[PDB]
Amino acid sequence: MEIVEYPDPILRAKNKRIDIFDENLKNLVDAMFDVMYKTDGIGLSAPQVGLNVQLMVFNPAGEPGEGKEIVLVNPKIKKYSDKLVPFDEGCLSFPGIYAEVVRPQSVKIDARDITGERFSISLSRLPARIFQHEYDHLEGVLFFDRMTDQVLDSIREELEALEKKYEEKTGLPSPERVEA
Ligand SMILES: CCCCC[C@H](CC(=O)NO)C(=O)N[C@H](C(=O)N1CCC[C@H]1CO)C(C)C
Ligand SMILES: [Zn+2]
Ligand SMILES: [Zn+2]
Ligand SMILES: [Zn+2]
Ligand SMILES: [Zn+2]
Ligand SMILES: [Zn+2]
């Protein structure tokens, strides 16, 4: 069973609206949470497990029997804060790579829950940091796309190692290259 790693194109592909809110959905959500707990993550998005659908799960505590198991399908940011804050992010699709990303502090979101119920929440602190990370995923935006040029530099070679890994595995050239 498998986390999709950069530079896999799955991570860049358009993700479908979810229309159907059934048990398969609940089983998917549940697989995702368990992937998160196994890999010590604090969120996951559907493309990261091979599925180009608009679905994210997160839990800010990142620990069993802690925090909240938050689910969001078909979300859309209605607004970002003006205030920006730094935070060191890693990503399960880029194993071992950690670097500063600056993002809005809070967001207003419109999203659906696991049954189909549309709602409207605000987020700040870690929940908004995780959300935005995962929402980028839903839009085929990766964390290094959001990194300043000096920060991207410090991880270039680490990204290329992932590029190489994918080339060695597939026999194909990487479909994208941080050298940009
Ligand atoms: C920070 C914003 C949300 C991060 C989400 C990722 C998981 C992921 O890639 N989701 O798309 C994660 O859990 N990353 C972890 C991460 O960045 N963490 C773990 C808790 C604190 C923070 C490191 O500052 C580790 C696994 C790299
Ligand atoms: Zn489970
Ligand atoms: Zn579980
Ligand atoms: Zn832990
Ligand atoms: Zn990620
Ligand atoms: Zn190079």
Side-chain angles (χ1 to χ4, degrees), residues 40-45 48 87-92 98 129-130 133-134 137:
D40 310 313
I42 63 189
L44 202 59
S45 69
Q48 297 182 282
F87 193 69
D88 292 14
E89 319 207 347
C91 181
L92 281 182
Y98 300 86
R129 189 53 169 231
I130 297 170
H133 189 103
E134 305 303 331
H137 273 295

Side-chain angles (χ1 to χ4, degrees), residues 81 104-107 121-124 126-130 132:
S81 323
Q105 199 167 243
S106 56
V107 298
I121 247 171
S122 300
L123 296 178
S124 53
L126 200 54
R129 189 53 169 231
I130 297 170
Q132 282 174 92

Side-chain angles (χ1 to χ4, degrees), residues 16 47 50 56 58 61 83 145-146 148 161 164 172 176:
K16 292 192 177 205
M56 68 168 73
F58 71 101
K83 205 197 171 161
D145 309 343
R146 294 264 190 213
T148 69
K164 182 96 223 181
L172 313 171
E176 62 167 306

Side-chain angles (χ1 to χ4, degrees), residues 17-25 27-76:
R17 198 196 48 259
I18 300 264
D19 275 334
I20 174 143
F21 298 79
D22 58 356
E23 234 106 24
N24 289 196
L25 184 52
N27 295 162
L28 184 45
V29 161
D30 164 79
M32 290 187 63
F33 271 123
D34 301 340
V35 158
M36 187 199 81
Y37 293 111
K38 192 187 172 72
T39 58
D40 310 313
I42 63 189
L44 202 59
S45 69
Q48 297 182 282
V49 308
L51 297 163
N52 289 113
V53 298
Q54 263 200 286
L55 170 67
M56 68 168 73
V57 309
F58 71 101
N59 171 5
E63 296 302 338
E66 295 170 60
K68 296 285 183 196
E69 279 180 356
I70 289 161
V71 184
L72 300 179
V73 349
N74 309 333
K76 202 199 192 293

Side-chain angles (χ1 to χ4, degrees), residues 99-107 109-116 119-124 126-149 151-155:
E100 179 173 283
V101 190
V102 302
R103 303 185 188 261
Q105 199 167 243
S106 56
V107 298
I109 295 153
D110 299 297
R112 268 98 119 192
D113 80 25
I114 202 174
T115 55
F119 70 80
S120 290
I121 247 171
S122 300
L123 296 178
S124 53
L126 200 54
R129 189 53 169 231
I130 297 170
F131 172 79
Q132 282 174 92
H133 189 103
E134 305 303 331
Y135 175 83
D136 272 357
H137 273 295
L138 292 198
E139 300 210 321
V141 166
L142 293 189
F143 79 147
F144 72 84
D145 309 343
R146 294 264 190 213
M147 283 169 197
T148 69
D149 286 306
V151 170
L152 196 74
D153 252 67
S154 61
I155 63 160

